[PDB]
Amino acid sequence: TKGPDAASKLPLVTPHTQCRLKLLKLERIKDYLLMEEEFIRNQEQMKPEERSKVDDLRGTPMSVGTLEEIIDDNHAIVSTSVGSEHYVSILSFVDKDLLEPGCSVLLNHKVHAVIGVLMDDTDPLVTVMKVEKAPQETYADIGGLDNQIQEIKESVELPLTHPEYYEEMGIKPPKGVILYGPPGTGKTLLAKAVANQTSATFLRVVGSELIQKYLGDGPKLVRELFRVAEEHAPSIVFIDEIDAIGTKRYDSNSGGEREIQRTMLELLNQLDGFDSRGDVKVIMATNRIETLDPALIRPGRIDRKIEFPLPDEKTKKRIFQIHTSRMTLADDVTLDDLIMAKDDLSGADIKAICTEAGLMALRERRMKVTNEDFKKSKENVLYKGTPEGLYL
Amino acid sequence: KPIRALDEGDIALLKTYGQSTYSRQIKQVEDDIQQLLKKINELTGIKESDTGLAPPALWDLAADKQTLQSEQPLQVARCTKIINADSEDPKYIINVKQFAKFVVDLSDQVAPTDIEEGMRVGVDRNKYQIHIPLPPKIDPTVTMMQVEEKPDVTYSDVGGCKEQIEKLREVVETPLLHPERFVNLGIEPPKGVLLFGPPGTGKTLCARAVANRTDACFIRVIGSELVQKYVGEGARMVRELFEMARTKKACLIFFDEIDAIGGDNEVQRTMLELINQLDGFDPRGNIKVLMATNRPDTLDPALMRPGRLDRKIEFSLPDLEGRTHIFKIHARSMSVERDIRFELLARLCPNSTGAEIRSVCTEAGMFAIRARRKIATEKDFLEAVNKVIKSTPRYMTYN
Amino acid sequence: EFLHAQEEVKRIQSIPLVIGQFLEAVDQNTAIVGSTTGSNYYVRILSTIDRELLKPNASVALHKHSNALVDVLPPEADSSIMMLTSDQKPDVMYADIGGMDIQKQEVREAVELPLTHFELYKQIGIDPPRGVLMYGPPGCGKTMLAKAVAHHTTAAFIRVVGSEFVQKYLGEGPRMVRDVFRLAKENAPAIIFIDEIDAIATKRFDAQTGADREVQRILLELLNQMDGFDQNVNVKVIMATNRADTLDPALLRPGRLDRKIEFPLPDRRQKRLIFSTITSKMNLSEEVDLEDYVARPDKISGADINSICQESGMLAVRENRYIVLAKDFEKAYKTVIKKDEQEHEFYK
Amino acid sequence: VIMATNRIDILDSALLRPGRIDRKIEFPPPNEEARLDILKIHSRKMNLTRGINLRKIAELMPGASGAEVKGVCTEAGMYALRERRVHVTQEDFEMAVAKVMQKDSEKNMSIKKLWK
Amino acid sequence: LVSNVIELLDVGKCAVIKTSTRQTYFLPVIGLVDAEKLKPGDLVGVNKDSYLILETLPTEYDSRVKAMEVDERPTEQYSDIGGLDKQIQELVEAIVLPMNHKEKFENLGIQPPKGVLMYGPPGTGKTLLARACAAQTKATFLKLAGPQLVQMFIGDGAKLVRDAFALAKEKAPSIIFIDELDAIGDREVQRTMLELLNQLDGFQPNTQVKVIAATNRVDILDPALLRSGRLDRKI
Amino acid sequence: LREELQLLQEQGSYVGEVVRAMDKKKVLVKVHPEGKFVVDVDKNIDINDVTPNCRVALRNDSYTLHKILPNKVDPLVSLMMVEKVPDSTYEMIGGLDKQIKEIKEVIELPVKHPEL
Amino acid sequence: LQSVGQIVGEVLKQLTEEKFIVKATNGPRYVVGCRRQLDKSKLKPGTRVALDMTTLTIMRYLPREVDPLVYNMSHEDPGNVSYSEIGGLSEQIRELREVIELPLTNPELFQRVGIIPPKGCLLYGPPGTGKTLLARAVASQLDCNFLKVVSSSIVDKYIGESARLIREMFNYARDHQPCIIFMDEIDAIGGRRFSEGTSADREIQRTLMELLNQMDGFDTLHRVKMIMATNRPDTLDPALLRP
Ligand SMILES: Nc1ncnc2c1ncn2[C@@H]1O[C@H](COP(=O)(O)OP(=O)(O)OP(=O)(O)O)[C@@H](O)[C@H]1O
Ligand SMILES: Nc1ncnc2c1ncn2[C@@H]1O[C@H](COP(=O)(O)OP(=O)(O)O)[C@@H](O)[C@H]1O
Ligand SMILES: Nc1ncnc2c1ncn2[C@@H]1O[C@H](COP(=O)(O)OP(=O)(O)O)[C@@H](O)[C@H]1O
Ligand SMILES: Nc1ncnc2c1ncn2[C@@H]1O[C@H](COP(=O)(O)OP(=O)(O)O)[C@@H](O)[C@H]1O
Ligand SMILES: Nc1ncnc2c1ncn2[C@@H]1O[C@H](COP(=O)(O)OP(=O)(O)O)[C@@H](O)[C@H]1O
Ligand SMILES: [Mg+2]
Ligand SMILES: [Mg+2]
């Protein structure tokens, strides 16, 4: 199988302080891009029977179907995208060894005999579900969550890099990992960081994206997604908001609920389908962990469960340092009164506090955020306990 | 203090005022970087798919043209009631997938004998007459029906389910190993047992252990498979697997996750077909069925009626001795010290299923990996059981 | 030749034609239409078609064999919800509704006067009321006043009941609300009457199940359609309920329900007017104390007075005499307003 | 993106979370000055009479939303319309305020006197 | 091409059909087949192009009834049931004795008992006696459940009970069988028993199909069911 | 008129989303609901302009890529564009001055001058 | 053999004197004409119609499609029970005979007297008192269309289905005048509407609200007389209990 088609990953510029070194590095990257475009264009310019007859035999147009059975070497059971399936022949030129139940055979428009196979069929949905440009966020952009980052690296990175420890100890690599916690703790940021540092194919999925209107399209989409992940091995599948489909299993009455249950049973089956030794891992995030099915999180399916607690005081100050690392703060800003206040501040809340403090600074015609601006911002962004006096 | 909207002069001053001299150049270079990257991605493009053309040594192009002209394409349909053909009404209801249902005759090629209800019929596209039956030819090495002959797990591997393993031994061995004893005790050999218990208790593993001891091949069938895409001809699936089991020597049929099947038109076809293959098939056969699901009631009431599945083995969460035995069994395959107090770990995880125990061992291995140590210590197992199990209160009021 | 070509162009617009939705224009003469057959086609727009009527999602007629955009339809011709036809119009007049002079005036000032004398409102420089709530005890004339309004209106009357909005399929209730309001908007100055509005417009609460969430979604769609982002013009909405206090406060505010008209049980003079207007078609009452019957203090609605007269007619038929007198009228009065209690004495 | 609701408290925490929704702006019922401003905005097209004191009308609407102020303007216009006039007097605004802001109180004094 | 006849309309009869190609069509004339039975739901072989009913086909499975196993051969000879001699004598005299002497019943000018009832502690042989009666009468057996029907949402009234009774009447040496007591918020069971009374009361004249209505206790009794006709014969 | 009559007799062209251009002669496009076909490009359209996930036109039934159509936006959502701007100005809003400034600091200021 | 069958759909709008918007069931909609000889004045919107399969023209009209539960509830034989088989109900049977059948036999008598015929009545009493029998006998005597429905059997788990079933019942009743809808156990659907209440409590209120509007609502009922039987009249809603 073809290896991992990772993201673009342009080299990171380290200074970021708007200095000469940043100019040097950015100009170097631009120089290399220019010599790349020059080469590609010039090599486009420089230098210029049976195939045509086989194209004629194929005809025009040629429909695309999914192979499902192969009775003999000259007959098979293909299914058109509509849903209908036919007992069709395989012409000689079709390379047989590529025929494997679940491929994308090319079918003649009339008498749908197999005239070819499509190695890459990936439908637009699963194609956009594949990460092409790595997110700019990085582990350096994550404050705190040292244990969480360590666990995710042990889960989806250590088997990818030197894995000899895993079989040296005899334990299996953790097939799949799920992140949970209150909203805004860093579940999606930690997946962005993984995608930025990964060396494998990263497949971002919304979870609710897998559900499709037409009957059989949901399980087909899930099957295609994981088939791409395996064929793109090594790969990482990030199904964000798994609770969109991960809710408690209950007996279904309507057709739509039956289709939803079918899609999730397909996802669970295909999660069981690949071995843990395989280099395809799944990563799922949710806020309502308690509402998930107690079969998607089975120890035999998703062993790890990375908790994302609301940041503590030191993690709060780390996040504040990270998000104020690009500000022109004054010398008066303590930043300690804010992390003092016993609240439920999260990473998102701290980032919004920083943004609001910047907006207060703009409101004063000044570009140097002060302690007073942070003070008003914290109250401004914090929305909404025990009556005051009961608990001293 | 009313907020004052930023005037155009303020906008102009704030933009430039304090700024890096290089900032303009930086911004321009970064924008040019993005434009250049877009240009590269635009000018590479058009990656050739190169469809599955075999080397020209295999192209009999004239023959493909002739088979295109001659060989008709047949749509695949699911057959239904025979409507009493008997050479007087040679008609059948066939459901052509999502297209429609029809009532069609035979073909000169086919015969009435090999066409019945339920198999895959290849109908034509004009008259829709059944032109060739296409048995699913399932024999599924691409999916479930484990078909494992002698599972690697043995009698020593299973730990804790001693009462359970003894009841299983009785039912699926004493007839299988000593048929004469049941014959001379005047009783039909146990037709089967339903192994019910909380999930992860290991009932599957205990069954595979006795299968390895019986030296009879172990067949494990999942239910979700034939709930999902491979629905319909599941009756023919179980037909062919029971048939090959008859061709096979002494066997051990095992249905796990059968709750999905038991809990229904094609599904109902599947269990009435297994009724035909259990009641209709003589109960004296060596294809003993091993039913197993957590649900003890979701099974269809017509299934456990006498003359069928006869007893039920109640698996329960392993006890302290069971838990330490499971811990030792799972740690045998791990690089750990020789002085690990597995009784301590068994104590620390009460009401813990076997799957939880294997996850605890895996987490102990991961904890040992974390400190970059080739040997896992007892502290690693303690931390693993602290992490997995439990997902001041018990230390300050109890003592 | 030009006459012949024009005849051919007119002939291509013949029937039958498949209806489609004009998705988006591509050129001056071509467009993308989604035919109701479940497919999208890139077709050719007829030149004679007026262009600015060709708006997105507008229902257009396509040639049967070529899908060419042959002609454009009225904006909401294919509306699922039906209007009130000429024959469907009720025969109740304002005269048949005795009394409720102030109720009639307050309904007319919002549902009738703006449609016929908008110059008055423009001269005064105020927005005429767009929405009235008709609440009170049961059987006091609400639905009759709605029927009378439908009779005496030049508007496009749309009659719905509140429970009709609640659909089995998810998202179909709000869709029906959207379609009925869109039909009213795309039509002439129109009136929407939603009888039993409190079936869906009960006070919003923390819904904990799918059904309650869907009903509150219907209510929210009603609110956002009445006074949402895109305002409606010449679309007056009448809704009647028995329990106004259970209605959502967002529904009971000016701009959505500018007038909450109370329909109390008839008092003294109103009872006399109701008796006179119901016994007008009645036979002569041979000088019975109708004024005293009115004068009796009893909490009876107009429906009860109609019942009293109806019972009088039934008794007169039963004893075979066409002229009612005090005996059968009195028996009818006792029968209708019985108000039997038998309540255990310890309560009072 | 802009969102509006009357019940923020029932909105999900994952949606109210900052970074997804910043600056949760509250629209409190207008105070007396804001009510006067709304009255002057919605009475711009009316034909007011010399001697109209919209400040008194604003003071007559304690805790009244802007929609109720517009309804007060509309009802005063209708009181003018009923007498077939075009100008609107202070008395018209007073009765309009009385009619629009009319609400059901606690009729039972015994229930109302439960609390001190 | 097979179609499901939606209904028959009078014009002299016209029928609208739903062909298996998800299309609904009207027929001014009913094909080349008779048009008197023509049940509203009877599958019909309609023309592939002109769509006229060439001929009618046998009926189809109605889901739960196919799931409602017949077990037509129950294999009892009263030697399986023991200790219930009076009970089986009562059952015989209540079901099969009127079945063969229905003539002596109409001589009296009264109707035969349309359903027997029994009650007793669980495991006392109530189902075994039902199977024994089915064997000795060679009558079709249906094992309708009692606690299962209380669930399955609102709809287990005139959708399954009626389904159980309806198509049993064509393979009709038949004995349909109610089991453990059932409940003979709380509104679904009310609908279930309303369907029971107004469907069992709407029974057959010859009573070729009988109901046996075994229960588990005598504590909960509905007079509308325990009356004559529905459930009067009590064992 | 005669030319229009002539082009009105040709069948409409199906629309479709080209997932990718397989080759300098073949293009694989999904058309709802016929399925996915590997169509060719006629003489007119240059294939380098055939970008993935762009709406196209396929001929009568030969399925030849013959025109590139604007990007697919389904009508149910394309209706949500505010084509006709509503007539409500800040001058007709009483009070809410602070609210207006706060909403402008997120709706206007970021878009207008992101440099700040 | 010569017949070809016809597509069936519902008319949606009358674009002009000839062009009709017609939507075929589970299919697309068209603008179609009508047959030369046909009563265009009756082809109202929503009227089920038949279309020629080829030319797609209005071939013939169809009666409105009847709901399957409405069908089974309307096609139950009353058993032609006479009036003799009631007994001991002389005053009540005479009263109900008046209120139901008198408008169905000599409506001109009511027209002259000066009243509108009463729209229906209630029979309350202990179970087994023969209210169902009395209504069944009334129906047999009148020899008119009779919908015998039992309340608590029209309630459904699906949210909007019970009110829809009530609507379909009354639509059949209006289509098949003269008709008598006997709804037994109205105590089920009809119940003093109250606040709070579980989703079910409210759903039943919504149903009662439909029944109410479907009886005395904007659209006046004609020749459709209702008979409602219950054992608990006291719990009935005052709006339902209102005249
Ligand atoms: N530990 C952290 N350090 C720095 N920034 C953080 C941290 N946690 C969260 N943030 C900030 O919070 C923002 C939103 O976080 P993120 O998208 O990861 O949330 P989430 O937990 O996945 O939320 P949800 O489940 O509600 O969608 C990020 O863009 C980031 O700037
Ligand atoms: N008694 C036992 N001895 C050893 N391992 C066990 C035991 N019970 C469960 N396990 C472990 O559980 C895992 C599989 O459990 P499984 O048999 O699938 O559970 P179920 O009871 O649901 O079939 C295996 O890895 C096995 O090692
Ligand atoms: N003002 C009135 N004048 C004459 N008849 C009235 C009046 N009010 C009520 N009625 C009688 O009562 C009935 C009105 O019922 P309706 O208005 O539908 O009650 P609701 O208030 O529940 O809508 C009418 O049929 C009419 O005969
Ligand atoms: N008198 C009896 N003779 C023989 N077997 C009996 C007798 N009574 C009960 N049984 C046994 O009990 C079982 C039937 O129980 P039963 O009471 O019919 O079921 P339920 O109580 O669930 O309706 C059968 O296996 C039957 O063999
Ligand atoms: N006058 C009568 N009063 C009560 N019941 C009677 C009368 N005449 C006959 N019956 C019997 O009562 C039964 C009627 O039941 P039904 O009408 O359902 O009672 P209810 O109306 O109380 O439900 C009939 O089967 C009949 O045998
Ligand atoms: Mg997230
Ligand atoms: Mg009313």
Swiss-Prot record, chain A:
Crosslinked residue numbers (Glycyl lysine isopeptide (Lys-Gly) (interchain with G-Cter in ubiquitin)): K192
Topology of the protein relative to the lipid bilayer: Lipid-anchor
UniProt region (Disordered), positions on chain: 45-59
Modified residues (Phosphothreonine): T14, T386
Any single biological process term in GO: proteasome-mediated ubiquitin-dependent protein catabolic process
Quaternary structure, from the entry: Component of the 19S proteasome regulatory particle complex. The 26S proteasome consists of a 20S core particle (CP) and two 19S regulatory subunits (RP). The regulatory particle is made of a lid composed of 9 subunits, a base containing 6 ATPases including PSMC1 and few additional components. Interacts with SCA7. Interacts with NGLY1. Interacts with PAAF1.
Name of the protein: 26S proteasome regulatory subunit 4
Source organism phylogeny: Eukaryota, Metazoa, Chordata, Craniata, Vertebrata
Swiss-Prot record, chain B:
Organism superkingdom: Eukaryota
PTM summary: Monoubiquitinated by RNF181.
A cellular-component GO term for this protein: nucleoplasm
Pfam families: AAA, AAA_lid_3, PRS7_OB
UniProt-annotated location(s): Cytoplasm
Protein keywords: Acetylation, ATP-binding, Cytoplasm, Nucleotide-binding, Phosphoprotein, Proteasome, Ubl conjugation
Listed InterPro entries: 26S_Proteasome_ATPase, AAA+_ATPase, AAA_lid_3, ATPase_AAA_core, ATPase_AAA_CS, NA-bd_OB-fold, P-loop_NTPase, PRS7-like_OB
Stated induction or repression of this protein's expression: Expression is not cell cycle-dependent and occurs throughout the cell cycle.
Binding site for ATP: G197, P198, P199, G200, T201, G202, K203, T204
Residue positions where N6-acetyllysine is found in the record: K97
One of the protein's GO biological processes: proteasome-mediated ubiquitin-dependent protein catabolic process
CDD domains assigned to the protein according to its UniProt record, in alphabetical order: RecA-like_PAN_like
Any GO MF annotation of the entry: ATP binding
Subunit (UniProt): Component of the 19S proteasome regulatory particle complex. The 26S proteasome consists of a 20S core particle (CP) and two 19S regulatory subunits (RP). The regulatory particle is made of a lid composed of 9 subunits, a base containing 6 ATPases including PSMC2 and few additional components. Interacts with NDC80/HEC; this interaction is detected only during M phase. Interacts and SQSTM1. Interacts with PAAF1. Directly interacts with TRIM5.
Family the UniProt entry places it in: Belongs to the AAA ATPase family.
UniProt-recorded name of the protein: 26S proteasome regulatory subunit 7
Source organism of the structure: Homo sapiens
Gene label: PSMC2
From Swiss-Prot, chain C:
GO molecular function, one term: ATP hydrolysis activity
Gene Ontology biological process terms from the UniProt entry: blastocyst development; proteasome-mediated ubiquitin-dependent protein catabolic process; proteolysis
Function according to Swiss-Prot or TrEMBL: Component of the 26S proteasome, a multiprotein complex involved in the ATP-dependent degradation of ubiquitinated proteins. This complex plays a key role in the maintenance of protein homeostasis by removing misfolded or damaged proteins, which could impair cellular functions, and by removing proteins whose functions are no longer required. Therefore, the proteasome participates in numerous cellular processes, including cell cycle progression, apoptosis, or DNA damage repair.
Keywords for this protein: Acetylation, ATP-binding, Cytoplasm, Nucleotide-binding, Nucleus, Phosphoprotein, Proteasome
Leader sequence residues: none
Protein name per Swiss-Prot or TrEMBL: 26S proteasome regulatory subunit 6B
Subcellular location: Cytoplasm; Nucleus
Residue positions, PTM N6-acetyllysine: K327, K331
Superkingdom to which the source organism belongs: Eukaryota
Entry similarity comment: Belongs to the AAA ATPase family.
Primary location: cytoplasm
Residues noted as binding ATP in the record, renumbered to the chain: G136, P137, P138, G139, C140, G141, K142, T143
GO annotations of cellular component type: ciliary basal body; cytosol; membrane; nucleoplasm; nucleus; proteasome accessory complex; proteasome complex; proteasome regulatory particle, base subcomplex
Organism: Homo sapiens
Keyword Nucleus tagged: yes
Curated annotation (Swiss-Prot), chain F:
Stretch forming the signal peptide: none
Residues modified as Phosphoserine: S62
Entire protein: shown range: 59 to 174 of 406
Protein name: 26S proteasome regulatory subunit 8
Chain's role: Component of the 26S proteasome, a multiprotein complex involved in the ATP-dependent degradation of ubiquitinated proteins. This complex plays a key role in the maintenance of protein homeostasis by removing misfolded or damaged proteins, which could impair cellular functions, and by removing proteins whose functions are no longer required. Therefore, the proteasome participates in numerous cellular processes, including cell cycle progression, apoptosis, or DNA damage repair.
Subcellular location: Cytoplasm; Nucleus
Subunit composition and interactions: Component of the 19S proteasome regulatory particle complex. The 26S proteasome consists of a 20S core particle (CP) and two 19S regulatory subunits (RP). The regulatory particle is made of a lid composed of 9 subunits, a base containing 6 ATPases including PSMC5 and few additional components. Component of a complex with USP49 and RUVBL1. Interacts with PRPF19. Interacts with TRIM5. Interacts with NDC80. Interacts with PAAF1. Interacts, in vitro, with the thyroid hormone receptor (in a thyroid hormone T3-dependent manner) and with retinoid X receptor (RXR). Interacts with ERCC6.
Family listed: Belongs to the AAA ATPase family.
Disulfide bonds: none
